[PDB]
Amino acid sequence: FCGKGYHLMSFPQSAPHGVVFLHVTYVPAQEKNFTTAPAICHDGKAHFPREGVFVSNGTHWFVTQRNFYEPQIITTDNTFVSGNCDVVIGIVNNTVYDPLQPELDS
Amino acid sequence: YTMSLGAENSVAYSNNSIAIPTNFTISVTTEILPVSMTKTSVDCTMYICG
Amino acid sequence: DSTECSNLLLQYGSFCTQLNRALTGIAVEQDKNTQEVFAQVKQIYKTPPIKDFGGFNFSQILPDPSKPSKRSPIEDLLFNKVTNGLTVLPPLLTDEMIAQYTSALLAGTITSGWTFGAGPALQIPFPMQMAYRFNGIGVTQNVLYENQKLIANQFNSAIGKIQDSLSSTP
Ligand SMILES: *[C@@H]1O[C@H](CO)[C@@H](O[C@@H]2O[C@H](CO)[C@@H](O)[C@H](O)[C@H]2NC(C)=O)[C@H](O)[C@H]1NC(C)=O
Ligand SMILES: *[C@@H]1O[C@H](CO)[C@@H](O[C@@H]2O[C@H](CO)[C@@H](O)[C@H](O)[C@H]2NC(C)=O)[C@H](O)[C@H]1NC(C)=O
Ligand SMILES: *[C@@H]1O[C@H](CO)[C@@H](O[C@@H]2O[C@H](CO)[C@@H](O)[C@H](O)[C@H]2NC(C)=O)[C@H](O)[C@H]1NC(C)=O
Ligand SMILES: *[C@@H]1O[C@H](CO)[C@@H](O[C@@H]2O[C@H](CO)[C@@H](O)[C@H](O)[C@H]2NC(C)=O)[C@H](O)[C@H]1NC(C)=O
Ligand SMILES: *[C@@H]1O[C@H](CO)[C@@H](O[C@@H]2O[C@H](CO)[C@@H](O)[C@H](O)[C@H]2NC(C)=O)[C@H](O)[C@H]1NC(C)=O
Ligand SMILES: *[C@@H]1O[C@H](CO)[C@@H](O)[C@H](O)[C@H]1NC(C)=O
Protein backbone atom coordinates (compact mmCIF):
# COMPACT_ATOMS: atom_id res chain seq x y z
CA PHE A 1 0.00 0.00 0.00
CA CYS A 2 2.86 2.39 0.76
CA GLY A 3 5.60 1.17 -1.58
CA LYS A 4 7.41 -2.05 -2.33
CA GLY A 5 9.01 -3.56 0.76
CA TYR A 6 8.48 -3.14 4.47
CA HIS A 7 7.11 0.39 4.80
CA LEU A 8 9.09 2.77 7.01
CA MET A 9 7.71 6.23 6.20
CA SER A 10 6.41 8.41 3.38
CA PHE A 11 6.83 12.00 2.25
CA PRO A 12 4.21 14.03 0.33
CA GLN A 13 5.07 16.32 -2.58
CA SER A 14 2.68 18.62 -4.41
CA ALA A 15 2.24 18.16 -8.16
CA PRO A 16 0.07 19.91 -10.79
CA HIS A 17 -3.41 18.53 -10.08
CA GLY A 18 -1.83 15.71 -8.09
CA VAL A 19 0.29 14.34 -5.28
CA VAL A 20 3.56 12.38 -5.35
CA PHE A 21 4.33 10.10 -2.42
CA LEU A 22 7.97 9.24 -1.79
CA HIS A 23 7.69 5.91 0.00
CA VAL A 24 10.74 5.09 2.12
CA THR A 25 10.78 1.32 2.64
CA TYR A 26 13.13 -1.29 4.07
CA VAL A 27 14.23 -4.02 1.65
CA PRO A 28 16.12 -7.10 2.92
CA ALA A 29 19.36 -7.88 1.12
CA GLN A 30 22.38 -10.23 1.15
CA GLU A 31 20.49 -13.23 2.50
CA LYS A 32 22.33 -16.32 3.74
CA ASN A 33 21.33 -19.96 4.15
CA PHE A 34 21.08 -21.44 7.64
CA THR A 35 19.89 -24.77 9.02
CA THR A 36 16.75 -24.23 11.08
CA ALA A 37 14.76 -26.14 13.68
CA PRO A 38 11.33 -25.47 15.22
CA ALA A 39 12.45 -26.09 18.81
CA ILE A 40 15.46 -26.95 20.98
CA CYS A 41 15.38 -30.04 23.20
CA HIS A 42 17.12 -29.47 26.54
CA ASP A 43 16.71 -31.43 29.81
CA GLY A 44 13.66 -33.18 28.39
CA LYS A 45 11.98 -29.83 27.72
CA ALA A 46 11.11 -28.08 24.46
CA HIS A 47 12.32 -24.50 24.04
CA PHE A 48 10.78 -22.12 21.50
CA PRO A 49 12.02 -18.64 20.48
CA ARG A 50 10.27 -15.77 22.23
CA GLU A 51 10.51 -13.41 19.25
CA GLY A 52 13.14 -14.81 16.88
CA VAL A 53 14.15 -18.04 15.15
CA PHE A 54 16.70 -20.80 15.71
CA VAL A 55 19.46 -20.83 13.09
CA SER A 56 22.58 -22.92 12.65
CA ASN A 57 25.72 -22.06 10.70
CA GLY A 58 26.70 -25.73 10.54
CA THR A 59 28.04 -26.61 13.99
CA HIS A 60 26.51 -24.18 16.49
CA TRP A 61 22.94 -23.09 17.20
CA PHE A 62 21.85 -19.48 17.75
CA VAL A 63 18.65 -17.46 17.98
CA THR A 64 18.20 -14.38 15.81
CA GLN A 65 15.55 -11.86 14.86
CA ARG A 66 13.59 -12.86 11.77
CA ASN A 67 14.31 -9.86 9.52
CA PHE A 68 18.04 -9.38 10.19
CA TYR A 69 20.87 -11.79 10.93
CA GLU A 70 22.01 -11.14 14.51
CA PRO A 71 23.03 -14.45 16.11
CA GLN A 72 22.78 -14.67 19.89
CA ILE A 73 23.39 -17.49 22.36
CA ILE A 74 20.29 -19.56 23.07
CA THR A 75 19.46 -18.76 26.70
CA THR A 76 16.41 -18.96 28.95
CA ASP A 77 15.78 -15.22 28.50
CA ASN A 78 14.93 -15.32 24.78
CA THR A 79 13.20 -18.72 24.78
CA PHE A 80 10.16 -20.18 26.51
CA VAL A 81 9.38 -23.74 27.59
CA SER A 82 6.23 -25.60 26.54
CA GLY A 83 6.03 -29.37 26.88
CA ASN A 84 8.58 -32.11 26.38
CA CYS A 85 10.55 -33.14 23.29
CA ASP A 86 8.28 -36.02 22.24
CA VAL A 87 5.60 -33.95 20.47
CA VAL A 88 7.34 -31.36 18.26
CA ILE A 89 8.38 -32.76 14.88
CA GLY A 90 11.96 -31.87 14.01
CA ILE A 91 13.16 -30.83 17.47
CA VAL A 92 16.95 -31.01 17.77
CA ASN A 93 19.22 -31.47 20.78
CA ASN A 94 21.21 -28.43 21.88
CA THR A 95 22.22 -26.88 25.18
CA VAL A 96 20.32 -23.91 26.61
CA TYR A 97 22.42 -21.53 28.68
CA ASP A 98 21.20 -20.20 32.01
CA PRO A 99 22.34 -16.68 32.99
CA LEU A 100 21.59 -17.40 36.66
CA GLN A 101 23.79 -20.53 36.60
CA PRO A 102 27.20 -18.79 37.16
CA GLU A 103 25.65 -16.68 39.93
CA LEU A 104 24.67 -19.39 42.42
CA ASP A 105 27.83 -21.34 41.51
CA SER A 106 29.95 -18.45 42.81
CA TYR B 1 7.15 -12.39 -29.83
CA THR B 2 5.37 -14.13 -26.98
CA MET B 3 5.75 -11.90 -23.93
CA SER B 4 7.90 -13.17 -21.07
CA LEU B 5 6.06 -13.15 -17.75
CA GLY B 6 9.35 -12.84 -15.90
CA ALA B 7 12.63 -14.44 -14.94
CA GLU B 8 12.38 -17.93 -13.50
CA ASN B 9 13.43 -18.21 -9.85
CA SER B 10 13.29 -21.68 -8.29
CA VAL B 11 13.36 -21.10 -4.53
CA ALA B 12 15.59 -23.68 -2.83
CA TYR B 13 12.93 -25.06 -0.52
CA SER B 14 13.72 -27.78 1.99
CA ASN B 15 12.14 -28.76 5.28
CA ASN B 16 15.00 -27.57 7.51
CA SER B 17 16.67 -24.61 5.75
CA ILE B 18 15.92 -20.90 6.16
CA ALA B 19 17.27 -17.78 4.47
CA ILE B 20 18.05 -14.88 6.81
CA PRO B 21 18.96 -11.40 5.51
CA THR B 22 22.32 -10.02 6.61
CA ASN B 23 21.89 -6.51 5.16
CA PHE B 24 19.29 -4.01 4.03
CA THR B 25 18.54 -1.36 1.43
CA ILE B 26 16.66 1.84 2.23
CA SER B 27 14.60 2.16 -0.95
CA VAL B 28 12.62 5.28 -1.88
CA THR B 29 9.95 4.86 -4.55
CA THR B 30 7.57 7.29 -6.23
CA GLU B 31 3.78 7.02 -6.42
CA ILE B 32 1.91 9.60 -8.50
CA LEU B 33 -1.82 10.02 -7.83
CA PRO B 34 -4.09 12.58 -9.55
CA VAL B 35 -6.24 14.57 -7.12
CA SER B 36 -8.25 17.15 -9.08
CA MET B 37 -9.15 18.19 -12.62
CA THR B 38 -9.43 21.56 -14.31
CA LYS B 39 -12.65 23.23 -13.17
CA THR B 40 -14.52 23.89 -16.42
CA SER B 41 -17.88 25.62 -16.68
CA VAL B 42 -20.01 25.70 -19.83
CA ASP B 43 -22.84 28.18 -20.31
CA CYS B 44 -25.44 25.93 -21.96
CA THR B 45 -27.46 28.81 -23.42
CA MET B 46 -24.32 30.53 -24.70
CA TYR B 47 -22.82 27.31 -26.07
CA ILE B 48 -25.93 26.25 -27.97
CA CYS B 49 -27.19 29.69 -28.97
CA GLY B 50 -24.54 32.38 -28.50
CA ASP C 1 -21.57 -0.19 -46.72
CA SER C 2 -23.88 2.68 -47.75
CA THR C 3 -21.91 5.69 -49.00
CA GLU C 4 -24.94 8.01 -48.82
CA CYS C 5 -25.53 7.05 -45.19
CA SER C 6 -21.90 7.83 -44.31
CA ASN C 7 -22.16 11.16 -46.16
CA LEU C 8 -25.21 12.03 -44.06
CA LEU C 9 -23.43 10.73 -40.94
CA LEU C 10 -20.55 13.16 -41.53
CA GLN C 11 -22.98 16.04 -40.87
CA TYR C 12 -23.07 15.01 -37.18
CA GLY C 13 -19.32 15.42 -36.72
CA SER C 14 -16.95 13.36 -34.57
CA PHE C 15 -19.48 11.28 -32.64
CA CYS C 16 -18.09 8.04 -34.11
CA THR C 17 -14.54 9.03 -33.14
CA GLN C 18 -15.75 9.71 -29.58
CA LEU C 19 -17.48 6.32 -29.32
CA ASN C 20 -14.47 4.45 -30.75
CA ARG C 21 -12.13 6.32 -28.38
CA ALA C 22 -14.32 5.46 -25.37
CA LEU C 23 -14.47 1.78 -26.36
CA THR C 24 -10.69 1.74 -26.92
CA GLY C 25 -10.20 3.25 -23.46
CA ILE C 26 -12.39 0.54 -21.93
CA ALA C 27 -10.51 -2.16 -23.87
CA VAL C 28 -7.10 -0.98 -22.67
CA GLU C 29 -8.52 -0.50 -19.15
CA GLN C 30 -9.42 -4.20 -18.95
CA ASP C 31 -5.84 -5.19 -19.80
CA LYS C 32 -4.57 -2.64 -17.26
CA ASN C 33 -6.86 -4.23 -14.65
CA THR C 34 -5.51 -7.71 -15.42
CA GLN C 35 -1.92 -6.42 -15.17
CA GLU C 36 -2.66 -4.72 -11.85
CA VAL C 37 -4.32 -7.78 -10.33
CA PHE C 38 -2.18 -10.68 -11.51
CA ALA C 39 1.22 -9.27 -12.57
CA GLN C 40 2.46 -8.18 -9.16
CA VAL C 41 5.61 -10.36 -9.22
CA LYS C 42 8.50 -10.12 -11.67
CA GLN C 43 9.91 -13.54 -10.71
CA ILE C 44 8.27 -16.78 -11.84
CA TYR C 45 8.64 -18.95 -8.74
CA LYS C 46 8.34 -22.73 -8.96
CA THR C 47 7.58 -25.33 -6.31
CA PRO C 48 10.18 -27.99 -5.47
CA PRO C 49 9.65 -31.41 -7.09
CA ILE C 50 9.25 -33.05 -3.66
CA LYS C 51 6.03 -31.86 -2.00
CA ASP C 52 7.21 -32.24 1.61
CA PHE C 53 5.45 -29.39 3.40
CA GLY C 54 5.06 -31.03 6.82
CA GLY C 55 1.71 -32.69 6.11
CA PHE C 56 0.16 -29.79 4.19
CA ASN C 57 -1.42 -30.83 0.88
CA PHE C 58 -1.60 -28.28 -1.94
CA SER C 59 -2.49 -30.63 -4.82
CA GLN C 60 -5.91 -29.04 -5.32
CA ILE C 61 -4.38 -25.57 -5.78
CA LEU C 62 -1.04 -26.34 -7.46
CA PRO C 63 -1.04 -26.85 -11.26
CA ASP C 64 -1.71 -30.37 -12.51
CA PRO C 65 1.11 -31.72 -14.74
CA SER C 66 -1.31 -34.19 -16.39
CA LYS C 67 -3.52 -31.42 -17.77
CA PRO C 68 -2.43 -29.69 -21.00
CA SER C 69 -3.77 -26.34 -19.74
CA LYS C 70 -1.39 -26.49 -16.71
CA ARG C 71 -4.22 -25.45 -14.39
CA SER C 72 -5.02 -26.52 -10.86
CA PRO C 73 -8.03 -28.83 -10.29
CA ILE C 74 -9.82 -25.91 -8.61
CA GLU C 75 -8.94 -23.59 -11.52
CA ASP C 76 -10.01 -26.27 -14.03
CA LEU C 77 -13.35 -26.59 -12.23
CA LEU C 78 -13.72 -22.79 -12.23
CA PHE C 79 -13.10 -22.63 -15.98
CA ASN C 80 -15.59 -25.46 -16.56
CA LYS C 81 -18.26 -23.80 -14.42
CA VAL C 82 -18.21 -20.45 -16.29
CA THR C 83 -20.01 -20.45 -19.64
CA ASN C 84 -22.56 -5.73 -37.90
CA GLY C 85 -19.40 -3.93 -36.87
CA LEU C 86 -18.91 -5.73 -33.56
CA THR C 87 -15.51 -7.25 -32.77
CA VAL C 88 -14.21 -8.99 -29.66
CA LEU C 89 -10.59 -8.17 -28.96
CA PRO C 90 -8.59 -10.96 -27.29
CA PRO C 91 -7.11 -10.18 -23.87
CA LEU C 92 -3.41 -9.38 -23.69
CA LEU C 93 -2.84 -12.09 -21.07
CA THR C 94 -4.11 -15.51 -22.10
CA ASP C 95 -5.55 -17.97 -19.60
CA GLU C 96 -2.41 -20.12 -19.39
CA MET C 97 -0.23 -17.07 -18.64
CA ILE C 98 -2.68 -15.90 -15.96
CA ALA C 99 -2.56 -19.44 -14.53
CA GLN C 100 1.25 -19.21 -14.65
CA TYR C 101 1.11 -15.93 -12.71
CA THR C 102 -1.13 -17.53 -10.07
CA SER C 103 1.22 -20.54 -9.94
CA ALA C 104 4.18 -18.21 -9.37
CA LEU C 105 2.28 -16.44 -6.58
CA LEU C 106 1.35 -19.80 -5.00
CA ALA C 107 4.96 -21.03 -5.19
CA GLY C 108 6.20 -17.79 -3.65
CA THR C 109 3.70 -17.81 -0.79
CA ILE C 110 4.28 -21.52 -0.09
CA THR C 111 8.08 -21.65 -0.27
CA SER C 112 8.87 -18.14 1.01
CA GLY C 113 5.85 -16.85 2.96
CA TRP C 114 5.46 -13.08 2.69
CA THR C 115 9.17 -12.45 2.06
CA PHE C 116 8.88 -12.55 -1.74
CA GLY C 117 6.31 -9.74 -1.70
CA ALA C 118 8.64 -7.37 0.16
CA GLY C 119 11.95 -8.18 -1.53
CA PRO C 120 13.99 -11.27 -2.35
CA ALA C 121 12.32 -14.62 -1.79
CA LEU C 122 13.71 -16.10 1.43
CA GLN C 123 13.07 -19.82 1.81
CA ILE C 124 11.50 -21.05 5.04
CA PRO C 125 9.90 -24.38 6.05
CA PHE C 126 6.13 -24.23 5.75
CA PRO C 127 5.35 -25.26 9.40
CA MET C 128 7.69 -22.49 10.58
CA GLN C 129 5.93 -20.05 8.23
CA MET C 130 2.57 -21.17 9.64
CA ALA C 131 3.97 -20.62 13.15
CA TYR C 132 4.93 -17.08 12.13
CA ARG C 133 1.36 -16.54 10.90
CA PHE C 134 0.11 -17.94 14.22
CA ASN C 135 2.24 -15.36 16.03
CA GLY C 136 0.80 -12.68 13.76
CA ILE C 137 -2.69 -13.42 15.10
CA GLY C 138 -1.42 -13.64 18.68
CA VAL C 139 -1.12 -17.41 19.18
CA THR C 140 2.17 -18.87 20.42
CA GLN C 141 4.38 -21.03 18.18
CA ASN C 142 4.14 -24.05 20.53
CA VAL C 143 0.40 -24.42 19.83
CA LEU C 144 1.13 -24.74 16.10
CA TYR C 145 4.01 -27.21 16.58
CA GLU C 146 2.20 -29.46 19.08
CA ASN C 147 -0.96 -29.64 16.94
CA GLN C 148 0.71 -29.63 13.51
CA LYS C 149 -0.83 -32.90 12.29
CA LEU C 150 -4.31 -31.73 13.34
CA ILE C 151 -3.84 -28.35 11.63
CA ALA C 152 -2.61 -30.00 8.42
CA ASN C 153 -5.55 -32.44 8.46
CA GLN C 154 -8.03 -29.60 9.02
CA PHE C 155 -6.46 -27.56 6.21
CA ASN C 156 -6.61 -30.49 3.76
CA SER C 157 -10.21 -31.24 4.77
CA ALA C 158 -11.19 -27.59 4.29
CA ILE C 159 -9.54 -27.46 0.84
CA GLY C 160 -11.42 -30.62 -0.15
CA LYS C 161 -14.67 -29.14 1.15
CA ILE C 162 -13.97 -26.03 -0.97
CA GLN C 163 -13.60 -28.17 -4.09
CA ASP C 164 -16.75 -30.17 -3.24
CA SER C 165 -18.75 -26.99 -2.53
CA LEU C 166 -17.68 -25.43 -5.83
CA SER C 167 -18.47 -28.64 -7.71
CA SER C 168 -21.88 -28.99 -6.03
CA THR C 169 -23.24 -25.41 -6.14
CA PRO C 170 -24.41 -23.86 -9.44
C1 LIG D 1 29.49 -20.89 13.71
O1 LIG D 1 29.58 -19.75 14.58
C2 LIG D 1 30.38 -19.94 15.76
C3 LIG D 1 30.31 -18.65 16.54
O2 LIG D 1 30.73 -17.54 15.76
C4 LIG D 1 31.81 -20.33 15.37
O3 LIG D 1 32.56 -20.65 16.54
C5 LIG D 1 33.75 -19.84 16.64
O4 LIG D 1 34.67 -20.05 15.55
C6 LIG D 1 35.85 -19.23 15.62
C7 LIG D 1 36.65 -19.51 14.37
O5 LIG D 1 37.51 -20.63 14.54
C8 LIG D 1 36.62 -19.54 16.90
O6 LIG D 1 37.75 -18.67 16.99
C9 LIG D 1 35.72 -19.35 18.11
O7 LIG D 1 36.40 -19.75 19.30
C10 LIG D 1 34.44 -20.18 17.97
N1 LIG D 1 33.55 -19.96 19.09
C11 LIG D 1 33.03 -20.96 19.81
C12 LIG D 1 32.13 -20.56 20.94
O8 LIG D 1 33.27 -22.14 19.55
C13 LIG D 1 31.80 -21.54 14.44
O9 LIG D 1 33.12 -21.81 13.98
C14 LIG D 1 30.89 -21.29 13.24
N2 LIG D 1 30.84 -22.46 12.38
C15 LIG D 1 30.94 -22.39 11.05
C16 LIG D 1 30.88 -23.69 10.32
O10 LIG D 1 31.08 -21.32 10.47
C1 LIG E 1 18.31 -36.19 21.83
O1 LIG E 1 18.44 -36.57 23.21
C2 LIG E 1 17.54 -37.60 23.64
C3 LIG E 1 17.79 -37.81 25.12
O2 LIG E 1 19.05 -37.27 25.51
C4 LIG E 1 17.75 -38.87 22.81
O3 LIG E 1 16.77 -39.84 23.17
C5 LIG E 1 17.39 -41.09 23.50
O4 LIG E 1 17.72 -41.87 22.32
C6 LIG E 1 18.34 -43.13 22.60
C7 LIG E 1 18.66 -43.76 21.26
O5 LIG E 1 17.51 -43.77 20.41
C8 LIG E 1 17.42 -44.00 23.46
O6 LIG E 1 18.08 -45.22 23.78
C9 LIG E 1 17.05 -43.25 24.73
O7 LIG E 1 16.12 -44.01 25.49
C10 LIG E 1 16.44 -41.89 24.40
N1 LIG E 1 16.13 -41.16 25.62
C11 LIG E 1 15.01 -40.45 25.77
C12 LIG E 1 14.85 -39.75 27.09
O8 LIG E 1 14.16 -40.37 24.89
C13 LIG E 1 17.62 -38.54 21.32
O9 LIG E 1 17.92 -39.69 20.54
C14 LIG E 1 18.57 -37.41 20.94
N2 LIG E 1 18.40 -37.06 19.53
C15 LIG E 1 19.43 -36.75 18.74
C16 LIG E 1 19.08 -36.42 17.32
O10 LIG E 1 20.59 -36.72 19.15
C1 LIG F 1 21.11 -21.97 -0.38
O1 LIG F 1 21.38 -23.29 -0.84
C2 LIG F 1 20.77 -23.62 -2.09
C3 LIG F 1 21.10 -25.08 -2.36
O2 LIG F 1 22.35 -25.43 -1.79
C4 LIG F 1 21.27 -22.68 -3.19
O3 LIG F 1 20.53 -22.92 -4.38
C5 LIG F 1 21.40 -23.21 -5.50
O4 LIG F 1 22.00 -22.03 -6.07
C6 LIG F 1 22.89 -22.31 -7.16
C7 LIG F 1 23.51 -20.99 -7.57
O5 LIG F 1 22.98 -20.52 -8.80
C8 LIG F 1 22.12 -22.98 -8.30
O6 LIG F 1 23.03 -23.31 -9.35
C9 LIG F 1 21.43 -24.24 -7.79
O7 LIG F 1 20.62 -24.80 -8.81
C10 LIG F 1 20.56 -23.92 -6.57
N1 LIG F 1 19.96 -25.13 -6.04
C11 LIG F 1 18.65 -25.24 -5.79
C12 LIG F 1 18.19 -26.56 -5.24
O8 LIG F 1 17.87 -24.32 -5.99
C13 LIG F 1 21.06 -21.22 -2.77
O9 LIG F 1 21.67 -20.35 -3.72
C14 LIG F 1 21.65 -20.95 -1.39
N2 LIG F 1 21.36 -19.59 -0.96
C15 LIG F 1 22.30 -18.65 -0.84
C16 LIG F 1 21.83 -17.30 -0.39
O10 LIG F 1 23.48 -18.88 -1.07
C1 LIG G 1 25.67 -3.74 3.75
O1 LIG G 1 25.45 -3.06 2.50
C2 LIG G 1 26.11 -1.79 2.37
C3 LIG G 1 25.67 -1.21 1.05
O2 LIG G 1 24.32 -0.76 1.10
C4 LIG G 1 27.62 -1.99 2.49
O3 LIG G 1 28.28 -0.72 2.44
C5 LIG G 1 29.28 -0.73 1.39
O4 LIG G 1 30.46 -1.47 1.76
C6 LIG G 1 31.45 -1.53 0.72
C7 LIG G 1 32.57 -2.40 1.24
O5 LIG G 1 32.59 -2.44 2.66
C8 LIG G 1 31.92 -0.12 0.36
O6 LIG G 1 32.84 -0.19 -0.72
C9 LIG G 1 30.72 0.75 -0.03
O7 LIG G 1 31.15 2.09 -0.23
C10 LIG G 1 29.65 0.72 1.06
N1 LIG G 1 28.48 1.48 0.65
C11 LIG G 1 27.84 2.33 1.45
C12 LIG G 1 26.66 3.03 0.86
O8 LIG G 1 28.21 2.53 2.61
C13 LIG G 1 27.95 -2.68 3.81
O9 LIG G 1 29.34 -2.96 3.88
C14 LIG G 1 27.16 -3.99 3.95
N2 LIG G 1 27.42 -4.60 5.24
C15 LIG G 1 27.50 -5.92 5.43
C16 LIG G 1 27.77 -6.37 6.83
O10 LIG G 1 27.36 -6.71 4.50
C1 LIG H 1 -2.72 -34.89 -1.40
O1 LIG H 1 -4.08 -34.84 -1.86
C2 LIG H 1 -4.36 -35.61 -3.03
C3 LIG H 1 -5.81 -35.34 -3.38
O2 LIG H 1 -6.54 -34.89 -2.25
C4 LIG H 1 -4.07 -37.09 -2.76
O3 LIG H 1 -4.29 -37.83 -3.96
C5 LIG H 1 -5.16 -38.95 -3.70
O4 LIG H 1 -4.42 -40.14 -3.36
C6 LIG H 1 -5.23 -41.30 -3.08
C7 LIG H 1 -4.29 -42.41 -2.69
O5 LIG H 1 -3.07 -42.32 -3.40
C8 LIG H 1 -6.09 -41.64 -4.30
O6 LIG H 1 -6.95 -42.73 -3.98
C9 LIG H 1 -6.92 -40.43 -4.72
O7 LIG H 1 -7.64 -40.72 -5.91
C10 LIG H 1 -6.01 -39.22 -4.95
N1 LIG H 1 -6.80 -38.05 -5.31
C11 LIG H 1 -6.57 -37.33 -6.40
C12 LIG H 1 -7.48 -36.16 -6.63
O8 LIG H 1 -5.66 -37.60 -7.18
C13 LIG H 1 -2.63 -37.26 -2.30
O9 LIG H 1 -2.38 -38.61 -1.94
C14 LIG H 1 -2.34 -36.35 -1.10
N2 LIG H 1 -0.96 -36.49 -0.64
C15 LIG H 1 0.16 -36.18 -1.32
C16 LIG H 1 1.45 -36.44 -0.59
O10 LIG H 1 0.16 -35.73 -2.46
C1 LIG I 1 13.10 -33.50 6.41
O1 LIG I 1 13.25 -34.37 5.27
C2 LIG I 1 14.18 -35.44 5.47
C3 LIG I 1 14.25 -36.20 4.16
O2 LIG I 1 14.59 -35.34 3.08
C4 LIG I 1 13.75 -36.31 6.65
O3 LIG I 1 14.74 -37.31 6.88
C5 LIG I 1 13.57 -35.45 7.90
O4 LIG I 1 13.05 -36.25 8.96
C6 LIG I 1 12.61 -34.30 7.61
N1 LIG I 1 12.46 -33.45 8.78
C7 LIG I 1 11.29 -32.94 9.16
C8 LIG I 1 11.31 -32.08 10.38
O5 LIG I 1 10.25 -33.15 8.54
Curated annotation (Swiss-Prot), chain B:
Protein name: Spike protein S2
Effect of A7V: In strain: Beta/B.1.351, Iota/B.1.526
Lineage: superkingdom: Viruses
Glycan-modified residues: N15, N23
Gene source species: Severe acute respiratory syndrome coronavirus 2 (2019-nCoV)
Function: Precursor of the fusion protein processed in the biosynthesis of the S protein and the formation of virus particle. Mediates fusion of the virion and cellular membranes by functioning as a class I viral fusion protein. Contains two viral fusion peptides that are unmasked after cleavage. The S2/S2' cleavage occurs during virus entry at the cell membrane by host TMPRSS2 or during endocytosis by host CSTL.
